[PDB]
RNA sequence: CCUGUCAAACUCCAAACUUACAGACGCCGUUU
RNA sequence: GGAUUAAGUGUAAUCCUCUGAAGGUGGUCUCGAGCCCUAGACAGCCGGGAUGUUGGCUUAGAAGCAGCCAUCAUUUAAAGA
RNA sequence: CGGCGAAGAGUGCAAGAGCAAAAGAUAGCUUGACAGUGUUCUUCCCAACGAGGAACGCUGACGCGAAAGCGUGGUCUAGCG
RNA sequence: UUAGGCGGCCACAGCGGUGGGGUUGCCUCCCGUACCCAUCCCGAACACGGAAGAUAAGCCCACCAGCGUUCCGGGGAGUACUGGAGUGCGCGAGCCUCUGGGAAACCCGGUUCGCCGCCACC
């Protein structure tokens, strides 16, 4: 029972793309004393016609969580813009963060996304022992039933601080 | 023209596209014709087609003589029954006496070694009973296909066996 | 199964145990009692619970001479959590002084010993301790710094079998000290990760253990 | 072009099934003396390799030179001398029928 | 999903056959 | 002993060398396949090839027979729009 | 940030071959790209022929490793007089 | 080994799927970072320390054949191809006979959901 219930592991928030902190070491400043911590990420692919070609990229990304630190955001967090909060909006996983997306190639990847919802927030769902698909060893996989479904997903977060809309 | 050291196999492989470029572009119209999709399979009456004899038949053999066979398949009433095959591709390239690689007969130029023959044809390549190109349909007359490939054969430089149903 | 057309590598593969491109590494150096296809100091780690064996392998068999796993302990000793290095500094050292010289520990067996002068007789050996050994391979595992896989190594060590190692990829102590400094002999056994977790709010006794070690080195039952 | 890697194509190369590194068991083997191994070269070796040309005739083993077995095709070259100069490992294989 | 074709520089397969070594029979050699 | 061939085909193993490829023959022999026959075939052979009506439409015409639609009825021994 | 993901993203350079607790990546350390002298194969199948090359030793001195061990340049076959 | 470790052959072992098993003997999942050690950031992993709790994963045991693979019966097929021989046929391309070998595709039915070695172990 209790272990079937869904909560959030990790969230990270993150940031656009493009050099962070251009006239000084800034926009992690945002990210800065908001969620408690402060990642930094780089990227790859260099021709980019109005980016960098730079390789190793400064680009900004970061947060992550953990448990309590997203909850104590994600509150205050939520609530934020959502002209639809939820919906369409996350998927078959569970939760989700988006907008509108373009016609890219998706689908044959690890699968990280563009997708902006709030200053692209990254709610992942997740109930249950789940630690055992992600964790090296013998991985396993998601039972595809213990699974997190969007109906079950829209519910949680939204049965605390905020309408589904 | 004429075909006479064409279409006899005294080579060996290739076509390879890697090693060879500058191939005419076939001018044997689509291999698919009568309607396609639907499964001409079933029906009463039967097929045709066989070579009868060693190979390598020119894109101008077959594209002459296959629609030629299809005009005179014309006479069901445009889109209406029959769907026709065409087997073998022309892929096989052949090169022919551009003077710079041995002497004598072709495939051998002047000197040694050198100017293997330059690009000029495609030719499929058949063996001794082998169904060049087939497919019927209902007994629409008599055999009005049996009629076709009566002209289709008459321009393959084999001896084509009409082959009974 | 598939196609076939495929050749599957399995062995011990296939759902895994052992390694292949170690455990191969391992192996080379022939150690063991005597001539091993394969031996090991092996060293595995459960939850709750940490397991030390040792021994050359056979055609069919990968036989052990002496094991301990902290769970025995506390044959003597003490019931505490097993799921910590110390107590996995205990055992595997525990092992040694079971494998470590009970049974047999490095090559020696009756009859003339390996080509080389050497002679073993009790008390500390003749012409070098050099020669007790045993290589420990920590299975599929992950080699860290101070990790109990390590530590198992050093009890298990002075426990008198000689392995090679690395020293300062090691505990240093404190995690498992060693009770007196200046002297690097001693049985040590320590849990300081865990303790000064509260100060002494209570709880927790790494005082007891340095108990156990201390029966460990001397002439103790199996 | 010319090279020990000549023209070899399927000799050398070792396929799909037993493909990646292979057992420890055969390059740790010891031969002594006259023994009759046959040769060849196992893919999926980096040393202790012979030549190309001969490399399925047997030869007979002799004394080891340095962390190699003098073996090769002691045996005769064509119909000729057991003109020989072996530099093969146990990773080559060993035995006789 | 059904359906139509190929490869000197393709291969999940795979001969006949050529070939190293050995034993056997044969043949040969120890006044040739 | 037996059968085929009527073209002097042929009397030409192989081949620079012996051509012949995708003209004709109810001369004759042999072999096979389809259909029709004693509810009588072929000749099979011999003779004959109904009225409304040139069916309606279409068309310059469209009269059983370019094409579309219909394909009835009568007189019959019989004869389809 | 999470999830899917045996490999479609490597190894200086042709082509072919080798490689996954690695030969690939990252980090650290280090100078064996050392001196001397051989054995063998190759060059030159068989079958003699130089320079060159390679495989594998030993002697001496080092490096790294807990140790077995690895290192006689760059995974192998071109880069030479 | 009523669950372990090291392997050999390297799909008959692969892919997918059903069922069963322990809780203090094992393997894990698991719990937790004082230490040895560790993440270009994360005790995730690696390493160490430990047993509050589980069999749900893994693993081990029994089993299913739909796909892939192995082998076999029957059919294809003594066909395709072929080593040796021929005053056998054919204008020729080529075919035939005798002798010695002998396939692939595919179909239908079985087989295969690993086998084996050493060691340790209620």
Same mark, same amino acid.
Not at chain 1, 72 to 81: D, N, Q, S, Y
Not at chain 3, 57 to 67: E, F, N, Q
Not at chain 3, 175 to 193: A, K, W
């Given at each position: 029972?209790?272990?079937?219930? &869904?909560?959030?592991?990790?969230? #990270? @928030?993150?940031?656009?793309? %493009?050099?962070?902190?251009?006239? &000084?070491?800034?926009?992690?400043? #945002? @990210?800065?004393?908001?969620? %408690?911590?402060?990642?930094?990420?780089?990227?790859?692919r260099y021709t980019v016609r109005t980016f960098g070609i730079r390789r190793n990229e400064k680009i900004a990304v970061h947060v992550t969580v953990r448990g309590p630190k997203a909850e104590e955001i994600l509150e205050r967090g939520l609530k934020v813009k959502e002209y639809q909060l939820r919906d369409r909006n996350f998927s078959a996983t569970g939760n989700f963060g988006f907008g509108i997306d373009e016609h890219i190639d998706l689908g044959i990847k690890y699968d990280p996304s563009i997708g902006i919802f709030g200053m692209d927030f990254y709610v992942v769902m997740n109930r249950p022992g789940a630690r055992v698909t992600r964790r090296k060893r013998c991985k396993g996989t998601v039972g595809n039933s213990h699974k997190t479904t969007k109906?079950?997903?829209?519910?949680?977060?939204?049965?605390?601080?905020?309408?589904?809309? | 023209?004429?075909?006479?050291?064409?279409?006899?196999?005294?080579?060996?492989?290739?076509?390879?596209?890697?090693?060879?470029?500058?191939?005419?572009?076939?001018?044997?119209?689509?291999?698919?014709?009568?309607?396609?999709?639907?499964?001409?399979?079933?029906?009463?009456?039967?097929?045709?087609?066989?070579?009868?004899?060693?190979?390598?038949?020119?894109?101008?053999?077959?594209?002459?003589?296959?629609?030629?066979?299809?005009?005179?398949?014309?006479?069901?009433?445009?889109?209406?029954?029959?769907?026709?095959?065409?087997?073998?591709?022309?892929?096989?390239?052949?090169?022919?006496?551009?003077?710079?690689?041995?002497?004598?007969?072709?495939?051998?130029?002047?000197?040694?070694?050198?100017?293997?023959?330059?690009?000029?044809?495609?030719?499929?390549?058949?063996?001794?009973?082998?169904?060049?190109?087939?497919?019927?349909?209902?007994?629409?007359?008599?055999?009005?296909?049996?009629?076709?490939?009566?002209?289709?054969?008459?321009?393959?430089?084999?001896?084509?066996?009409?082959?009974?149903? | 199964?598939?196609?076939?057309?495929?050749?599957?590598?399995?062995?011990?593969?296939?759902?895994?145990?052992?390694?292949?491109?170690?455990?191969?590494?391992?192996?080379?150096?022939?150690?063991?009692?005597?001539?091993?296809?394969?031996?090991?100091?092996?060293?595995?780690?459960?939850?709750?619970?940490?397991?030390?064996?040792?021994?050359?392998?056979?055609?069919?068999?990968?036989?052990?001479?002496?094991?301990?796993?902290?769970?025995?302990?506390?044959?003597?000793?003490?019931?505490?959590?097993?799921?910590?290095?110390?107590?996995?500094?205990?055992?595997?050292?525990?092992?040694?002084?079971?494998?470590?010289?009970?049974?047999?520990?490095?090559?020696?067996?009756?009859?003339?010993?390996?080509?080389?002068?050497?002679?073993?007789?009790?008390?500390?050996?003749?012409?070098?301790?050099?020669?007790?050994?045993?290589?420990?391979?920590?299975?599929?595992?992950?080699?860290?710094?101070?990790?109990?896989?390590?530590?198992?190594?050093?009890?298990?060590?002075?426990?008198?079998?000689?392995?090679?190692?690395?020293?300062?990829?090691?505990?240093?102590?404190?995690?498992?000290?060693?009770?007196?400094?200046?002297?690097?002999?001693?049985?040590?056994?320590?849990?300081?990760?865990?303790?000064?977790?509260?100060?002494?709010?209570?709880?927790?006794?790494?005082?007891?253990?340095?108990?156990?070690?201390?029966?460990?080195?001397?002439?103790?039952?199996? | 072009?010319?090279?020990?890697?000549?023209?070899?194509?399927?000799?050398?190369?070792?396929?799909?099934?037993?493909?990646?590194?292979?057992?420890?068991?055969?390059?740790?083997?010891?031969?002594?003396?006259?023994?009759?191994?046959?040769?060849?070269?196992?893919?999926?070796?980096?040393?202790?390799?012979?030549?190309?040309?001969?490399?399925?005739?047997?030869?007979?083993?002799?004394?080891?030179?340095?962390?190699?077995?003098?073996?090769?095709?002691?045996?005769?070259?064509?119909?000729?001398?057991?003109?020989?100069?072996?530099?093969?490992?146990?990773?080559?294989?060993?035995?006789?029928?």
């Amino acid at each position: 029972n209790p272990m079937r219930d &869904l909560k959030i592991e990790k969230l #990270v @928030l993150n940031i656009s793309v %493009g050099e962070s902190g251009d006239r &000084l070491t800034r926009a992690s400043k #945002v @990210l800065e004393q908001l969620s %408690g911590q402060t990642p930094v990420q780089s990227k790859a692919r260099y021709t980019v016609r109005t980016f960098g070609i730079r390789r190793n990229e400064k680009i900004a990304v970061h947060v992550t969580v953990r448990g309590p630190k997203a909850e104590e955001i994600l509150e205050r967090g939520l609530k934020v813009k959502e002209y639809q909060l939820r919906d369409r909006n996350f998927s078959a996983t569970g939760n989700f963060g988006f907008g509108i997306d373009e016609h890219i190639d998706l689908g044959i990847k690890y699968d990280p996304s563009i997708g902006i919802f709030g200053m692209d927030f990254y709610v992942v769902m997740n109930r249950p022992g789940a630690r055992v698909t992600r964790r090296k060893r013998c991985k396993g996989t998601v039972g595809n039933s213990h699974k997190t479904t969007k109906e079950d997903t829209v519910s949680w977060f939204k049965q605390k601080y905020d309408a589904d809309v | 023209r004429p075909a006479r050291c064409y279409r006899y196999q005294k080579n060996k492989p290739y076509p390879k596209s890697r090693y060879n470029r500058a191939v005419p572009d076939s001018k044997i119209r689509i291999y698919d014709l009568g309607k396609k999709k639907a499964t001409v399979d079933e029906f009463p009456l039967c097929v045709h087609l066989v070579s009868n004899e060693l190979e390598q038949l020119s894109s101008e053999a077959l594209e002459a003589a296959r629609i030629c066979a299809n005009k005179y398949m014309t006479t069901v009433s445009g889109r209406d029954a029959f769907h026709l095959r065409v087997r073998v591709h022309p892929f096989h390239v052949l090169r022919i006496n551009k003077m710079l690689s041995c002497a004598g007969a072709d495939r051998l130029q002047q000197g040694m070694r050198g100017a293997w023959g330059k690009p000029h044809g495609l030719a499929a390549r058949v063996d001794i009973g082998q169904i060049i190109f087939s497919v019927r349909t209902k007994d629409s007359n008599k055999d009005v296909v049996v009629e076709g490939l009566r002209r289709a054969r008459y321009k393959f430089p084999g001896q084509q066996k009409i082959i009974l149903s | 199964a598939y196609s076939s057309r495929f050749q599957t590598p399995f062995r011990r593969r296939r759902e895994g145990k052992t390694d292949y491109y170690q455990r191969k590494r391992l192996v080379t150096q022939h150690k063991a009692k005597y001539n091993t296809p394969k031996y090991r100091l092996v060293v595995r780690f459960t939850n709750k619970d940490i397991i030390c064996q040792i021994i050359s392998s056979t055609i069919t068999g990968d036989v052990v001479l002496a094991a301990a796993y902290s769970h025995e302990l506390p044959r003597y000793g003490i019931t505490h959590g097993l799921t910590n290095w110390a107590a996995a500094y205990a055992t595997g050292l525990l092992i040694a002084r079971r494998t470590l010289q009970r049974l047999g520990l490095d090559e020696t067996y009756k009859g003339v010993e390996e080509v080389e002068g050497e002679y073993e007789l009790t008390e500390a050996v003749e012409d070098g301790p050099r020669p007790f050994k045993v290589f420990l391979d920590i299975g599929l595992q992950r080699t860290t710094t101070g990790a109990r896989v390590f530590g198992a190594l050093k009890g298990a060590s002075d426990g008198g079998l000689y392995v090679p190692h690395s020293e300062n990829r090691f505990p240093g102590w404190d995690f498992e000290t060693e009770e007196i400094d200046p002297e690097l002999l001693r049985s040590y056994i320590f849990g300081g990760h865990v303790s000064q977790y509260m100060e002494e709010l209570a709880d927790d006794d790494e005082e007891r253990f340095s108990e156990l070690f201390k029966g460990y080195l001397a002439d103790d039952i199996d | 072009s010319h090279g020990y890697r000549s023209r070899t194509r399927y000799m050398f190369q070792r396929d799909f099934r037993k493909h990646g590194a292979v057992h420890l068991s055969t390059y740790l083997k010891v031969y002594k003396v006259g023994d009759i191994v046959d040769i060849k070269a196992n893919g999926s070796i980096q040393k202790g390799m012979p030549h190309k040309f001969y490399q399925g005739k047997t030869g007979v083993v002799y004394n080891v030179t340095k962390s190699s077995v003098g073996v090769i095709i002691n045996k005769m070259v064509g119909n000729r001398y057991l003109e020989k100069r072996l530099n093969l490992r146990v990773e080559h294989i060993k035995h006789s029928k």
